[PDB]
Every structure is written in structure tokens, then in C-alpha cells.
Design an enzyme around this catalytic site. Structure first.
Site, short mmCIF file in Angstrom:
data_model
loop_
_atom_site.label_atom_id
_atom_site.label_comp_id
_atom_site.label_asym_id
_atom_site.label_seq_id
_atom_site.Cartn_x
_atom_site.Cartn_y
_atom_site.Cartn_z
N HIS A 1 -5.31 -5.24 14.42
CA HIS A 1 -4.28 -4.36 14.92
C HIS A 1 -4.91 -3.43 15.93
O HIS A 1 -6.13 -3.43 16.12
CB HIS A 1 -3.61 -3.57 13.77
N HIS B 1 -4.60 0.73 17.82
CA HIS B 1 -4.12 2.09 17.91
C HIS B 1 -4.05 2.43 19.40
O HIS B 1 -4.93 2.02 20.16
CB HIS B 1 -5.04 3.08 17.17
N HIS C 1 -8.93 -3.04 16.17
CA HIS C 1 -9.63 -3.12 14.89
C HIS C 1 -9.45 -4.51 14.31
O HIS C 1 -8.33 -4.91 13.94
CB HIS C 1 -9.06 -2.11 13.90
N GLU D 1 -9.30 5.89 18.56
CA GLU D 1 -9.64 6.63 17.35
C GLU D 1 -11.07 7.13 17.48
O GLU D 1 -11.33 8.34 17.49
CB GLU D 1 -9.39 5.77 16.13
N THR E 1 -8.85 4.36 8.61
CA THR E 1 -8.37 5.44 9.46
C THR E 1 -6.92 5.81 9.20
O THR E 1 -6.40 6.71 9.87
CB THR E 1 -8.58 5.19 10.95
N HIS F 1 3.58 1.43 11.38
CA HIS F 1 2.43 2.27 11.81
C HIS F 1 1.69 1.61 12.97
O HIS F 1 1.12 2.32 13.78
CB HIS F 1 1.44 2.46 10.62
#
Ligand SMILES: [C]C1=[C][C]=C([B]([O])([O])[O])[C]=[C]1
Ligand SMILES: [Zn+2]
Length: 257
Positions: free
Chosen positions: A91, A93, A116, A103, A195, A61
Site C-alpha cells: 500500500h 501513503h 510499503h 511517512e 504506522t 485508510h
């Protein structure tokens, strides 16, 4: 079997995780004009000098840089927080294009990516217990925009070749997460959630106003990662972000005027 595709992405998550439609979901749009300055927030304290990074993992992911969280070594305190929160992992996104990937949004603006830094409240003893509590986690969110390279990110960029596919890990010791912070620690804060599934409503979000800059080459390398395992059809790891969710009965507070 959740993911970020058309048939398993964010619009489907509620079937397995009904809290997806809950009262304090993340991310949200940060309406800068409506956020209110709160002169009482206490100063925010990021104490990363003794951080001990261990490993980097492609979990299918995102990729996680993991830390030793068995002692107070890298901790977040102050700001809206009561008590001490230990860094467990960070990590990102990110998008397929530079105009999407974050996000959280700021006045509906999307950034190219979002970092994050995940921390858990030491009063709950372990991460798994912490995620079951309304004040279990504190996540420091940092926006990435494309421009100049971020020197402190390059060690991460360089290792990604060794964790291309789901389930791969590599040693990742002696990484200094202070190299990922912007100059200012001004922030917005609100109560929210994880999230990704399980979407637990356990997070105090602390979103920094100042983005960091990363180069086009740095983010391009993120986009060469794979969601799939080795020996499976290649699916590039891009657009691994959840869109903004309803604010509902929440107020976003600002640490700054
Ligand atoms: C287990 C876990 C930890 C952090 C996050 B996120 O995306 O909210 O920082 C999602 C899931
Ligand atoms: Zn995240």
C-alpha cells in the site's frame, strides 16, 4: 474510529492505542549524516518472480494490493533479516500536495508518497501471530517523487476507479511488484512499528535510499480516492500519513557508504 482527520488523527491515537507513545514507533526522520554504515549487513534479496497478486481493496485508510501468502512465492530475505519473510500486501501513503505524503523523512525532507511492501516472518506461521513478535514483520519502504511516470504503477492507477470508496475491492491478478522497485537496493534499517493503529512494535524497517519517480497524473488519481463509504459524504483520501516519531534509543544503520 481512528483516522487522519483533526478529531481522529495521529495526535489522538494514543488514547485508544497507548503504544503510540512507545519506545520503537514509526515512522522516523532518517538523519543521513548520523546513520552509520554497517559493513556486516548481509546482501538484501528480493525474490518476487513467483508473486501471485489477488485483489485490491480500499480499506478506508489506504488501498492494499494483496498477495497469496500461503506459500513462499514472493519473499524478502537477507539485509538485516534472519529467515524468510513472505509478501502479504503493499500500500501507499500520500499527500494532498506534492511536498508532503511520505511517512519517513530524509534529513527532514518529505516525499510526495511512500510505498510499503509488507512481509511477515514465516517462523510465526501467519500474519496475525507475526505482528505479536518483535521480529514479526519486514516492511520495505520506497519513496515516491513526482516527475516521470512509473510504467509499472499504471495498472494500479487504472483500477482505482473501481475501488473509489471504503470497502470496495476488485480482482487484481497478475500484477508484478518488481515494476515498483528502483534500480538500487541500498537501504537504511531500524526497528520500529506499524504506522497505523494498532501501532504494534513488530517491524524491521528497510527504507530504500533511491526514490521512484511517478507522474503528476499518477499521484492525482490516488487523491481522487475516498475515505468514506459509498453513499456517504465525500472525503478525499489524502494526507493518510503519520508524521515522524521520536527516535528514542535507536540507531539507524546504512547498507552503503
Ligand atoms: C496492518 C498494517 C500493516 C502495515 C502497516 B504500515 O503502514 O506500517 O506499513 C500498517 C498496518
Ligand atoms: Zn504503510
Amino acid at each position: 474510529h481512528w483516522g487522519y482527520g483533526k478529531h481522529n488523527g495521529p495526535e489522538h491515537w494514543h488514547k485508544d492505542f497507548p503504544i503510540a507513545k512507545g519506545e520503537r514507533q514509526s515512522p522516523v526522520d532518517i538523519d543521513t549524516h548520523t546513520a552509520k554504515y554497517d559493513p556486516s549487513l548481509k546482501p538484501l534479496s528480493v525474490s518476487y518472480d513467483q508473486a501471485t497478486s489477488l485483489r485490491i481493496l480500499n480499506n478506508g485508510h489506504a488501498f492494499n494490493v494483496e498477495f497469496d501468502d500461503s506459500q513462499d512465492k514472493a519473499v524478502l530475505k537477507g539485509g538485516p533479516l534472519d529467515g524468510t519473510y513472505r509478501l502479504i500486501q503493499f500500500h501507499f501513503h500520500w499527500g494532498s500536495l506534492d511536498g508532503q505524503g511520505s511517512e519517513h523523512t530524509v534529513d527532514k525532507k518529505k516525499y510526495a508518497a511512500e510505498l510499503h511492501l509488507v512481509h511477515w516472518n514465516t517462523k510465526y506461521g501467519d500474519f496475525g501471530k507475526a505482528v505479536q513478535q518483535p521480529d514479526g514483520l519486514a516492511v520495505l519502504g520506497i519513496f515516491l517523487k513526482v516527475g516521470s511516470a512509473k510504467p509499472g504503477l499504471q495498472k494500479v492507477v487504472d483500477v482505482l476507479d473501481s475501488i473509489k470508496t471504503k470497502g470496495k475491492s476488485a480482482d487484481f491478478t497478475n500484477f508484478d511488484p518488481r515494476g515498483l522497485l528502483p534500480e538500487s537496493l541500498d537501504y537504511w534499517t531500524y526497528p520500529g512499528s506499524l504506522t497505523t493503529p494498532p501501532l504494534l512494535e513488530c517491524v524491521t524497517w528497510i527504507v530504500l535510499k533511491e526514490p521512484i519517480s511517478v507522474s503528476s497524473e499518477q499521484v492525482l488519481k490516488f487523491r481522487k480516492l475516498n475515505f468514506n463509504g459509498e453513499g456517504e459524504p465525500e472525503e478525499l483520501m489524502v494526507d493518510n500519513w503519520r508524521p515522524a516519531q521520536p527516535l528514542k534509543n535507536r540507531q539507524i544503520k546504512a547498507s552503503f557508504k
